[PDB]
Amino acid sequence: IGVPIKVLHEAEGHIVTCETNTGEVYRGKLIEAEDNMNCQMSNITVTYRDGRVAQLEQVYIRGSKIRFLILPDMLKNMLKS
Amino acid sequence: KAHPPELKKFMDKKLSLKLNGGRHVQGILRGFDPFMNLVIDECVEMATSGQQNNIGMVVIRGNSIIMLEALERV
Amino acid sequence: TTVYEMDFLADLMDNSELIRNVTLCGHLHHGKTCFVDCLIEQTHPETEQERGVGIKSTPVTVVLPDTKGKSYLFNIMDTPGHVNFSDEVTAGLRISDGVVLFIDAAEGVMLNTERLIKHAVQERLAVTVCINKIDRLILELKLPPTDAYYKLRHIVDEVNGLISMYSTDENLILSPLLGNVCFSSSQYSICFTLGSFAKIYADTFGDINYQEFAKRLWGDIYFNPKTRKFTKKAPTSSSQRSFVEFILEPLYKILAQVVGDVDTSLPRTLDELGIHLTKEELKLNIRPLLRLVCKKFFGEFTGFVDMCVQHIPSPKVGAKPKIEHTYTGGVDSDLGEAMSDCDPDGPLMCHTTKMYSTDDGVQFHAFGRVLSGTIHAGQPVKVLGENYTLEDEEDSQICTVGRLWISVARYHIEVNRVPAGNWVLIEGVDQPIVKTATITEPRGNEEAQIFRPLKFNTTSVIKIAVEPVNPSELPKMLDGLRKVNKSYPSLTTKVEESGEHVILGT
Amino acid sequence: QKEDMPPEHVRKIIRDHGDMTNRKFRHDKRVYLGALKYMPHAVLKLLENMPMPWEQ
Amino acid sequence: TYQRWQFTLPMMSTLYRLANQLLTDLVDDNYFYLFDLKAFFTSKALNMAIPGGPKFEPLVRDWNEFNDINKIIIRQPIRTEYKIAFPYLYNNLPHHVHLTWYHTPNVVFIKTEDPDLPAFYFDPLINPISHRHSVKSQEPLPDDDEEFELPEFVEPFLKDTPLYTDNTANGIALLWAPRPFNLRSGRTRRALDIPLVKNWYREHCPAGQPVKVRVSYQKLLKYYVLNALKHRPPKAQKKRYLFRSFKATKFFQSTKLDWVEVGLQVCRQGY
Amino acid sequence: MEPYYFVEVQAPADCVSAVYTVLARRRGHVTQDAPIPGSPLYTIKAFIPAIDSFGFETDLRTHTQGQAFSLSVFHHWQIVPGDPLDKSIVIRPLEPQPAPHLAREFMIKTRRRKGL
Amino acid sequence: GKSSKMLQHIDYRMRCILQDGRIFIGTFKAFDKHMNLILCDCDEFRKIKPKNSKQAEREEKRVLGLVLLRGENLVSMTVEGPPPKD
RNA sequence: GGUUUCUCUUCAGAUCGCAUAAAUCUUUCGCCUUUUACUAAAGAUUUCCGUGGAGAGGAACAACCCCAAUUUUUUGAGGCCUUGCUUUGGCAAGGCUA
Numbered sequence A: 001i002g003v004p005i006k007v008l009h010e011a012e013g014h015i016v017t018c019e020t021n022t023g024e025v026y027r028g029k030l031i032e033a034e035d036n037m038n039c040q041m042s043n044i045t046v047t048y049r050d051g052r053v054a055q056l057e058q059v060y061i062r063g064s065k066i067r068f069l070i071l072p073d074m075l076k077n078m079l080k081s
Numbered sequence B: 001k002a003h004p005p006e007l008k009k010f011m012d013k014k015l016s017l018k019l020n021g022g023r024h025v026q027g028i029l030r031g032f033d034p035f036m037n038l039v040i041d042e043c044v045e046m047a048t049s050g051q052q053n054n055i056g057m058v059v060i061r062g063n064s065i066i067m068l069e070a071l072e073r074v
Numbered sequence C: 001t002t003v004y005e006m007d008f009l010a011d012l013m014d015n016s017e018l019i020r021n022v023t024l025c026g027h028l029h030h031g032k033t034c035f036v037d038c039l040i041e042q043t044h045p046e047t048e049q050e051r052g053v054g055i056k057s058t059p060v061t062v063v064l065p066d067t068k069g070k071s072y073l074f075n076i077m078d079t080p081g082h083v084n085f086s087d088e089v090t091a092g093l094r095i096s097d098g099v100v101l102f103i104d105a106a107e108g109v110m111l112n113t114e115r116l117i118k119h120a121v122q123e124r125l126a127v128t129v130c131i132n133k134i135d136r137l138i139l140e141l142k143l144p145p146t147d148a149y150y151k152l153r154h155i156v157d158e159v160n161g162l163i164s165m166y167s168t169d170e171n172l173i174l175s176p177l178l179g180n181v182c183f184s185s186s187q188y189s190i191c192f193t194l195g196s197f198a199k200i201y202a203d204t205f206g207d208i209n210y211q212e213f214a215k216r217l218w219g220d221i222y223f224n225p226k227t228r229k230f231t232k233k234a235p236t237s238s239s240q241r242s243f244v245e246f247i248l249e250p251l252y253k254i255l256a257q258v259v260g261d262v263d264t265s266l267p268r269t270l271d272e273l274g275i276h277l278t279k280e281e282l283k284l285n286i287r288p289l290l291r292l293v294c295k296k297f298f299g300e301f302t303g304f305v306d307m308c309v310q311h312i313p314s315p316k317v318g319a320k321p322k323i324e325h326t327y328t329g330g331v332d333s334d335l336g337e338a339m340s341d342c343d344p345d346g347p348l349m350c351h352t353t354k355m356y357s358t359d360d361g362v363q364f365h366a367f368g369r370v371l372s373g374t375i376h377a378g379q380p381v382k383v384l385g386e387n388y389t390l391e392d393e394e395d396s397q398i399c400t401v402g403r404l405w406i407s408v409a410r411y412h413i414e415v416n417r418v419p420a421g422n423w424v425l426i427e428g429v430d431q432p433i434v435k436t437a438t439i440t441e442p443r444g445n446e447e448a449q450i451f452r453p454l455k456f457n458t459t460s461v462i463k464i465a466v467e468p469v470n471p472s473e474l475p476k477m478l479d480g481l482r483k484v485n486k487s488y489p490s491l492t493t494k495v496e497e498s499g500e501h502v503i504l505g506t
Numbered sequence D: 001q002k003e004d005m006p007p008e009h010v011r012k013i014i015r016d017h018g019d020m021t022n023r024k025f026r027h028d029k030r031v032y033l034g035a036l037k038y039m040p041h042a043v044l045k046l047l048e049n050m051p052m053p054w055e056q
Numbered sequence E: 001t002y003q004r005w006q007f008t009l010p011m012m013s014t015l016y017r018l019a020n021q022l023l024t025d026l027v028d029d030n031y032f033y034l035f036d037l038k039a040f041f042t043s044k045a046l047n048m049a050i051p052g053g054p055k056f057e058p059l060v061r062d063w064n065e066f067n068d069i070n071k072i073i074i075r076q077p078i079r080t081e082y083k084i085a086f087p088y089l090y091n092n093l094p095h096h097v098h099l100t101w102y103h104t105p106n107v108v109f110i111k112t113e114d115p116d117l118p119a120f121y122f123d124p125l126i127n128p129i130s131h132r133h134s135v136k137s138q139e140p141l142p143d144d145d146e147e148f149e150l151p152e153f154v155e156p157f158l159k160d161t162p163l164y165t166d167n168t169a170n171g172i173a174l175l176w177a178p179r180p181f182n183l184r185s186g187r188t189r190r191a192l193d194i195p196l197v198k199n200w201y202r203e204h205c206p207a208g209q210p211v212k213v214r215v216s217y218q219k220l221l222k223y224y225v226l227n228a229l230k231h232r233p234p235k236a237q238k239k240r241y242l243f244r245s246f247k248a249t250k251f252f253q254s255t256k257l258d259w260v261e262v263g264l265q266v267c268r269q270g271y
Numbered sequence F: 001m002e003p004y005y006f007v008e009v010q011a012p013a014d015c016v017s018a019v020y021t022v023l024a025r026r027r028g029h030v031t032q033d034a035p036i037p038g039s040p041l042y043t044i045k046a047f048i049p050a051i052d053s054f055g056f057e058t059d060l061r062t063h064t065q066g067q068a069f070s071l072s073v074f075h076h077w078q079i080v081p082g083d084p085l086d087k088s089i090v091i092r093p094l095e096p097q098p099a100p101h102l103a104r105e106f107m108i109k110t111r112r113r114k115g116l
Numbered sequence G: 001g002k003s004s005k006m007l008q009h010i011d012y013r014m015r016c017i018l019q020d021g022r023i024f025i026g027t028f029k030a031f032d033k034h035m036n037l038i039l040c041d042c043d044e045f046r047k048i049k050p051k052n053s054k055q056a057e058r059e060e061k062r063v064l065g066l067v068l069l070r071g072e073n074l075v076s077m078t079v080e081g082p083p084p085k086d
Numbered sequence H: 001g002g003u004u005u006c007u008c009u010u011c012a013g014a015u016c017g018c019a020u021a022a023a024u025c026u027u028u029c030g031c032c033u034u035u036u037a038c039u040a041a042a043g044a045u046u047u048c049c050g051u052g053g054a055g056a057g058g059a060a061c062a063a064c065c066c067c068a069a070u071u072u073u074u075u076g077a078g079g080c081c082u083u084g085c086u087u088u089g090g091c092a093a094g095g096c097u098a
């Protein structure tokens, strides 16, 4: 698969977030992920187009619906590039 | 290739569909196809006017499908 | 006589749920330390030896990719295979959360395999099985594939019936379909399950569903070509079963090609298997060759890590069926639940089951797992004896931590802080304590309980009286008998009424 | 480089000298003598390459 | 320069068959259990002697209570085999001792009779499997008739190759050959450095050949052990080359001659 | 009562006689002998007193050229053939006592060391 | 065909412009098939990217960090910095 | 841009060289009238027969056709009205459409 997709796959379990195609953000821990980008997240926070922030228990969302996504300070460590 | 949603554990549970149009429905998500399509029965659409109106069984178009957020801990 | 990576391992530490605590067990000589050795190379490209027998067990901590790439923390307690050092199996099954019985392709069921499944049942761990040394069916045994499958099915059915002997609840029947058993030949660089075998099958070939495919192979299912559809018994093709057809036959030829047709048929079959090899690396001798080729085909380790993570409690799931046996209460008010959290937090109730002395001095390195709390350097901690009961506190000696070590097999890794979920080698609490200790908060008192001092499989029956030649150095001889009593689990010494020093052993 | 010779060269010198009695050579006398210190090298060398009975 | 050879497995199997006579028909080392260098080192150090092994001069040269004859039970009498198997349990002051032990997983590699029957071929020698049990088992068996189907691109990962050839049974036999043969490529040694008979004198039970030859066996064993024991790393180096220093001088010529000729030459020169 | 050991000896075909003889030498009680399927090996199983458990490994491997191999575990205690209390049974103090007197000696020597 | 034109600006700093118009400043440590961008220590800039303006260069700034974006919207790639040897 | 080979220089075996010789010294052991030549153990040091690492020249020999409706080379995300906002800019909101 792709190198960013592999970073995401190994990011299963670690603390991350995402910003979807519409401009809202959802943060969470790594629960599920696919090479097809179908994102399973849990105990997340949600911050909407004005900034409405809250908790969401679990969800699974299509890949194309994600534009950006935040990883923690760990993974940057396949440094062959 | 052709990997579908990991929707076995997610089957048979009520989730709210947020898709295009600001499109909000609720409904029991019990199945789909590997294109990320849904087939969600008991769907009550939550229009902008706030009304949740039940229409029943449909084929939950993954095409513009953004996300589904469930009401149980599955 | 790891700068950018120990941070990473530490965050995995604080994860406490990518981590796997197992004891690596089995019978004698059966491949364990060889797999571990090849594996330390997979990790770093960076008396026992001459005896050829493993005597004491060793802890290893490593970070391994599973078949999707998520790194895992692995605590592996590699045991002795010798019947008499089973006290090491006891300590290992204590401080770890599951067991991996590794069994030989050539033998199957014997003494330590049998009584090791027995010990693991009576202490309710996870049950893993890795059948190893599979060349011993092919090059050594010369067994055609059908009867090869026969023997494999036999080892499986014997061990399973025996676990049925020791287990009331048939919650688990083991066969490679579920994630129970890896297949390996440790020195020849091979680990696989039907899972990863078929998954690399796919990763090389067409798109087919690797997981559903893995669901189809072991256990008497056939496949007919024209249908391309797996069937219960209905080829009168009078052919093999899916597992044979897909794994044995091909690898039988793989080997027979490596060792028989090393010269001509290996270039073409090497192309056909996708691996290229340079002239100088085919200019190798047969066993180094077969090892390198098997690596470059079968990939690293995946049957093992996959099956293991697939059937692991992981102390965060962990604690709960354990505190029953571990703790003297299990769960009443304070500390059963305290550890039951398995969080890095507060209480700090610990179980040190090993003490490895420095070749230099008299001190030890205590070794045990963090059920509760978070231990760090200089932290005062108060130890809980084997005789320590709630209202016998003199037994509790109170100390601190000098330095903190973590173990890859024979390299020592010092840091300053560790949370619940791990094992650890403590410096500083050796002199007060005996075979087992249970550690608690220093100068912080809420209230503490202890675990029952470790119970064994074996009957100690042998009697050996010992004396110095000149009675003058008897206190030094006493220092020595101390140190052996502390470094050994059930070696029991007594100063007998006749005035003597007797040892009772296995 | 230092290069080989026809065998007949040495053969001629050696059958020439024979046993150093002829007053012709009369100085290889003393060099011959001084060569004794290495006669145990010649013998080890000769005997460790012997012809291994399947070759003639 | 004639080094570093590489060979073909046909070559190797033919050679093996030809040097079959001067060879050991052993497959592993569980034969030499109490008969190896380390056992001999322990014996030598304890001045004990294995039945068929060498004897060495003793290494170095009142009352006790454990030896009290009223307190002992002799049910099976101690012997030197035990005192060497467990050096520290069965001996006081065991000094300069090697603790040798071996539980080598016995190897079972079955000789064929003819080349004919296939490489993999169940021979009577193996015991007939006949694994028995209860009602054997059932599985979480994913029945078909729901569905599954193989996109007919894949194959059983290689079926276009036969399992065996006219090289397979060789390639298996050559997997347990003494060190010279169990290879395919390696350096060449000097002609002297090859001891042919080591495998012969290192055998454990000669079983009734004259006392002459049995004593011979043991004294060759002794020489072997001493050589092993007194071995130094070469420890130092300076690197004269006598013959190059000779050849680089204006008095030395060179040739290629016949052995016998240089032989009569050397003799004449010495005389 | 003295303990017994269960032993599990893998053996090639021939030395069955050997293990039988050795166990008889040490009061064996071979219970079981059965092949290993998929190999020309046998596995023999037997009891043997903790007393005569000593060096039996070396004895066996020596007599059979290491072909056989013995592993042992304590299995159970049992009655020793002796009458612990008879004064008319005397100890020839180094020769091996025959079965009627194993517990008699056992007591005498054990107390002689310890019990007085 | 020479195919380095990616990796040459890889291992180098890059300003990535998504179809959302903002400036994502990050190291191009790699690309992907769909052109996704996994770049660390990243900064999200919304008002401008600043170019030696006597007025200022810091307006509408946030720290994103290790960001992994899907290349579905990866629009423009420029070089904003050289390699920091870290 | 590589091997084979010649020669020239330079450093090392910590289990070797899957083989294994001799010498010197210190001390015990034995042969015994004296010394050499010996025995056979230990310890400490060496020579020799081979090998390995590095470099320099030099030589011979190889060679300047189909394609997109959840992640990018087709994608209908379209407009405006009004409001609130904020200094204008501009932001966010509801609706009408066709």
Ligand SMILES: Nc1nc2c(ncn2[C@@H]2O[C@H](COP(=O)(O)OP(=O)(O)OP(=O)(O)O)[C@@H](O)[C@H]2O)c(=O)[nH]1
Pocket: C027, C028, C029, C030, C031, C032, C033, C034, C035, C053, C054, C055, C078, C079, C080, C081, C082, C133, C134, C135, C184, C185, C186, C187, C188, C189, E105
């Ligand atoms: N022939 C063969 N042997 C193998 C293979 N993999 C492992 N082994 C065996 O593994 C041994 C290495 O030592 P181990 O047997 O693992 O030591 P151990 O069994 O762990 O000893 P304990 O620690 O006391 O249990 C080698 O002697 C091999 O006999 C293999 O693929 N082929």
Ligand SMILES: [Mg+2]
Pocket: C032, C033, C053, C054, C079, C080, C081
């Ligand atoms: Mg081991």
Ligand SMILES: [Mg+2]
Pocket: none
């Ligand atoms: Mg005189």
